[PDB]
Structure formats: C-alpha cells, structure tokens
C-alpha cells in the first residue's frame, strides 16, 4: 500500500510538447498555429500553466494519487449516457450445453460457490499480489481494485454519480447474492443456520427461485429496466422509488449484495460468439433478457437457459485486467474438484429465498415505459462483430522481434486510414497499477510515425519498394513502443492535462484558452477507442464505442490467433463494424507480407 510509488507528475514543458506533437497531423494547419500560440502563452514563464503546475505538486504530496478523484469523475461518474453498451464491459464465456433447467442451475450454483471462495480469499488477504500472478517487470502492482469487486455500487445522480464503498466489514454479515429470474429479484443468503451453504444447497435454493419466478401471479413490474437508462433519467426514477419504504428496503438489499446472478431465458434463435456478446451487453432489450439486470451493481453473472454465459461489469470501480483475474479464478474453481470432497455436504431446513417486493406508483409505470423505449434504441443502434483473426498471432509477431500489442495498434491505425484516408485521435488503455491507486492513462497510438507508414500502403503503392515500407513500419513500432513506456510509467499527457484543467476550474476562475481550444477538445474525442484484454481462459471482453461516430475495439492476442471485438453505432453512417473488422484483417495480412521481404 503505502510503499507503492506515488503517481509521477510529468514536467510541464514535456507534457505541452508531447501534446502539440500528438495533434499536429490531426488538425488543420491554421488551427494548429493558433494552438501553438495558446500553448506558448499557457506555459510561458510566470504564466497560468506554471501556477497550476505548482498547485498539482501541492496535490501530489497530499494525496495518495493526485488524479484519482478527477479521473473517476471524468471517465465515469460525470458521464450521463446509460451504462449498457456505452460504459459496461462484458466478458463472454464458451457456449455451454444445458440439456435441462437443472443443468443451468448446477452451473450457477458452482459459479456462486466459486465467487464465495474467491471472496473469502480477498476477505483473508490471501490473494497473491500481482506479479505473484500477472506481473510487472519487478514490482508488485496495486491490488485496491480487487477489494472493490463485490463491495461497490454506483448510485445515479442528477449531474454526478457516486461510487459507494462497502458493505465489506463490521457488520460480519453482508452475505447475499441477488438472483434475477423473469425480471424478478430474490435474496440468496449464502450463510443460513450459522453454516455457509454448500453447492448443493445453493442449487436447491435456485430451484425454488425458478419456481417462484415463473409464477405469472406474484410477477412484479421489471424494476431492473430503470437501471438501463440514462444516469439522470435513473436518478429521477430512483428518487420516486425512494418515497416508499418497501422500495427503499428492496433497493438496500440490492445495494449491499455481493453480486447479481442472472438466470436468462433462451434467446433468439442463435448462437454465435457475436450473438452471445449482444445478450451479455444489453440482453436483447425489454422482450428478451434486458430487464433481468441491475446495472449499478459491479458484477452481474449471466447464466442463460440456452448456454449463453458470462459477466457484465460496471467499469467505475475496476478495469479489465482485474475483472479478468477475478473471472479466471472462478472458471478455475468450477473446473476443479479433484479436491472439493463429498455432496450437499451440509444441510437443510432451509427457508425459501425472498422475492424483493416493490410499490410501483403510476409515475414509476411511466418511468418503465420510457426506459423500455430508450433500451430498445440501444439494442437497435449497436453494430457488433466478433472477428477472429486466424491467420497468425503472437508467435509470429514475437518471431519478428516486435511487440504484439504495438503491432496490433499500428494494424488498427492502417485499418482506419485505408477506410477513411486520415488518422483520428485514438485511445488505448495503459495501466498505471504500478502506482498507488493507479488505474489507467492513455497511449495515443495515432502517431505521426504511424501516419508516415500508412500513407505508403494506400497511397501510392504502385511503386515504392516493400523494403522502404518496412523501414516506415519499424519506425512506427518504435514510436508505439516508446509512447507505451511513457504511459505505463506515468509520463504521458492525458492524466496531467486533466488535472491542470480541473485545478483551473477550481480556484482560478473562468476557463482558460488552453482547455477551450478546439485542439484540446478534438484531442479527447476518441473516434478509435481500444484496449488489450488478454486471457488464458477461452473468453473474450467487449464494449461499445465512446463517441457517436466511433468504434470500440477490444482484442485478445493469442499465439496463433487474435480475437477482435469491434463496435460501432448504426446511427452514424460513416462507420460499419464488419467493414472495419475486415480492414483490420487485410491490414494484418499486408503487414506480415512486409515482414517477409
């Protein structure tokens, strides 16, 4: 904890220089000239920038992580878009085979019991510190994201949401799953009669849940749907629910849970990696499983009657690499046995799981109807493909003495240029977990050296020797590998500029020219938003785009294949997920050809 490094504060002039270098090929020439001037006044001697810097170092000696607050708010809590597709990740597991309902429930039972065994590790401070598993270079990494997997809840606000912590300690006691089935919610207590419940008994329990939920007279309105809407929409709807004590009870149960377990219905008529990911991202909407959810809770594990299984993530408390370590530990548990000796090894009398009740006013009936509609629009708008690139993977790339991540990043840039004949501001997640409280910074992969290389290969190709091209490829990799180190050691720009911008906002008045500049605003409009989410398990992460005219691109690089998860919005008529996915392959194809000259 406290012996971890504190997050650096870059030099003010290195951040300004990097910033202009980043943006010059991404804006018009006059606009840039204007940006040069704004930036020169911003960081001159005696200027605004140096005062703000000074107040940043006030803050960095004062706080464990000087950007925690700012980053949390700017990335997640301030965002008013609904959590489905815009914000919550999903990880999709292999298609399962559930002959009967009990097969489904047997799966859920063994998952829950895996979640309880993982929690216990955490509660015991028995989890190996990363690099004890994962690893970086010689250090240990910050493990604070793991302590937030089950003890968080994200409260919608009218302008700003709140990440609440804890139900984790004195208590003894928060210990219960919420189980959603047929859009109903049931309390599944995991300690009854002062005994933890076995596999067997949680199976027993879930049985009872499916009976009760499938009784059409007792069926309660789909309140989970409310969680799917936009933040300020849900803050208003929640506040009407707050007027009733039954409601309030029921909301508290959900907020204090460990996680949700979603017993989904059978879809659609189905089954591909792509279709199972759409179930995990938004459930299909109103008529399918999209109300069998509660988005403000950090982990919702989906165990679908048809075999679609995975986990939907509320991203505010933790990133993808901790979500994947947690999930792989659960899968590992569900394949282990070979030690877990004998059956419903403990008991019963058990009481049946309680159904959460609700008193839904006319007002709130209206709130459902509009949330239906909004959710329906996100279902129709998302353009998604799971693209499995099987022509090569990591092994190739590393036999070229290149970095898999960097090489993928440059292949993304060429995909984008051979579609659009320009580069655009691009986000790639870089962990800063070497630092206290560290989350991520940004790798801006849309480098001038990537534009140098992609303009050969669409652009007057006729001629132009492949060896020449290869040297441009090498230069762009080197540039990609240098920004990557920069960002994972706290030396890149995004986080710095954010905190200067926030510290401006504060004690020093109306807004500065530096942050009102159209260059600065363009710089944060990530039309390409990317992450590497590698696995060991046979599973993949996805997400939606972060701007209307954007793509989301999540990749799992394996030794002989790369899995790309490409999202876009049908409302923007200039993007197409199949188009871009196809352009990534042909970009990979072309860049291996270049290596073998």
Which residue ranges make up the annotated binding site for CoA? 393-405, 431, 532
What is the enclosing helix (H) or strand (E) of 388?
A: strand 382-389
Q: Is 46 left (phi over 0), alpha (psi -120 to 50) or beta?
A: left
What is the enclosing helix (H) or strand (E) of 329?
A: helix 320-334
Name residue, tokens 């008013």: 80
The one catalytic residue in 176, 282, 315, 367 is: 315
d(CA 500, CA 51): 10
Taking residue 56's Cβ as centre, other Cβ atoms within 10 Å add up to 19
Strand locations in 110-212 (E): 152-155, 162-165, 176-181, 184-189
d(CA 113, CA 553): 33
Q: Between β-strands 260-262 and 382-389, what pairing exists: parallel, antiparallel or unpaired?
A: unpaired
- 279-283-286 Cα angle (round to 5): 150
d(CA 182, CA 163): 28
Name residue, tokens 């669409």: 458
Quickly list DSSP for 454-500.
HHTTSSS-SSS-HHHHHHHHHHHHHHHHHHHHHHHTT-SSHHHHHHH
Beta-bridged to residue 528, according to DSSP, are: 426, 551
Rounded to 5 degrees, what are φ and ψ at 430? -130, 125
d(CA 593, CA 597): 7
Query: Is residue 315 annotated as a catalytic residue, yes or no?
Result: yes
Taking residue 190's Cβ as centre, other Cβ atoms within 10 Å add up to 18
**Do 327 and 91 form a contact (C-beta atoms < 8 A)?**
yes
d(CA 432, CA 442): 10
Name residue, tokens 């299984």: 309
For 382-465, where are the alpha helices, taking DSSP H only? 394-398, 404-420, 448-455
Displacement of CA 161 from its chain's centroid (Å): 17
- By three-state DSSP, how is residue 343 classified? coil
Tell me the helix, strand and coil percentages in the chain, rounded to 5: 45, 15, 40
Annotated binding site: 393-405, 431, 532
The catalytic residues are: 315
């Amino acid at each position: 904890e406290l012996d971890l490094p504190k997050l650096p504060v870059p030099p003010l002039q290195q951040t300004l220089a990097t910033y202009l270098q980043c943006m010059q090929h991404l804006v018009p020439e006059e606009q840039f000239r204007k940006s040069q001037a704004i930036v020169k006044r911003f960081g001159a001697p005696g200027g605004l920038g140096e005062t703000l810097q000074e107040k940043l170092l006030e803050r960095q000696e004062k706080t464990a992580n000087w950007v925690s607050e700012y980053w949390l708010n700017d990335m997640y809590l301030n965002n008013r878009l609904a959590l489905p597709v815009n914000s919550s990740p999903a990880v999709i597991f292999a298609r399962q085979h559930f002959q009967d309902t009990n097969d489904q429930l047997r799966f859920a039972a063994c998952l829950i019991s895996g979640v309880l065994s993982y929690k216990t590790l955490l509660d015991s401070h028995s989890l190996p510190t990363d690099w004890a598993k994962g690893q970086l270079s010689g250090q240990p990494l910050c493990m604070k994201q793991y302590y937030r997997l089950f003890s968080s809840y994200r409260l919608p606000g009218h302008t700003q949401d709140t990440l609440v912590a804890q139900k984790s300690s004195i208590m003894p006691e928060p210990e219960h799953v919420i189980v959603a089935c047929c859009n109903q919610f049931f309390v599944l207590d995991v300690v009854i009669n002062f005994r933890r419940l076995s596999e067997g008994d949680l199976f027993t329990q879930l049985r009872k849940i499916v009976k009760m939920a499938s009784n059409e007279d007792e069926r309660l309105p789909p309140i989970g749907l409310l969680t799917s809407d936009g933040r300020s929409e849900w803050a208003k709807a929640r506040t009407v629910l707050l007027k009733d004590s039954t409601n309030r009870d029921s909301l508290d149960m959900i907020e204090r849970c460990i996680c949700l377990v979603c017993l989904d219905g059978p879809g659609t008529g189905e089954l591909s990696d792509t279709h199972r990911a759409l179930q995990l991202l938004h459930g299909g909407g109103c008529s399918l499983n999209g109300a069998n959810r509660w988005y403000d809770k950090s982990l919702q594990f989906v165990v679908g009657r048809d075999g679609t299984c995975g986990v939907v993530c509320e991203h505010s408390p933790f990133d993808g690499i901790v979500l994947v370590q947690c999930t792989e530990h659960l899968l590992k548990h569900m394949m282990t046995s070979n030690k877990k000796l004998v059956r419903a090894d403990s008991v019963s009398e058990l009481p049946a799981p309680r159904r959460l009740r609700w008193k839904c006013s006319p007002e709130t009936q209206g709130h459902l109807a509009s949330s239906a509609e909004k959710l329906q629009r996100i279902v129709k708008n998302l353009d998604f493909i799971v693209y499995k690139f099987d022509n090569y993977g990591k092994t190739f790339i590393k036999k070229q003495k290149y970095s898999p991540d960097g090489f993928i990043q440059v292949a993304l840039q060429l995909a984008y240029y051979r579609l659009y004949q320009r580069l655009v501001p691009t986000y790639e997640s870089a962990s800063i977990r070497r630092f206290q409280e560290g989350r991520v910074d940004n790798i801006r992969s849309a480098t001038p050296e990537a534009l140098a290389f992609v303009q050969a290969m669409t652009d007057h190709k006729a001629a132009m020797p492949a060896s020449e091209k290869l040297q441009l490829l090498q230069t762009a990799m080197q540039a990609q590998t240098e920004y990557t180190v920069m960002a994972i050691t706290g030396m890149a720009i995004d986080n710095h500029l954010l905190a200067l911008r926030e510290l401006a906002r504060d004690l020093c008045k109306e807004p500065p020219e530096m942050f009102m500049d159209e260059t600065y605003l363009m710089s944060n409009r990530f039309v390409l938003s990317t992450s590497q989410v590698p696995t060991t398990m046979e599973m993949f992460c996805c997400y939606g785009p972060v701007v209307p005219n954007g793509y989301g691109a999540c990749y799992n690089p394996q030794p002989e294949a790369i899995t790309f998860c490409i999202s876009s919005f049908h409302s923007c008529k200039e993007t197409s997920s199949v188009e871009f996915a196809e352009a990534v392959g042909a970009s990979l194809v072309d860049m291996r050809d270049l290596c073998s000259s």
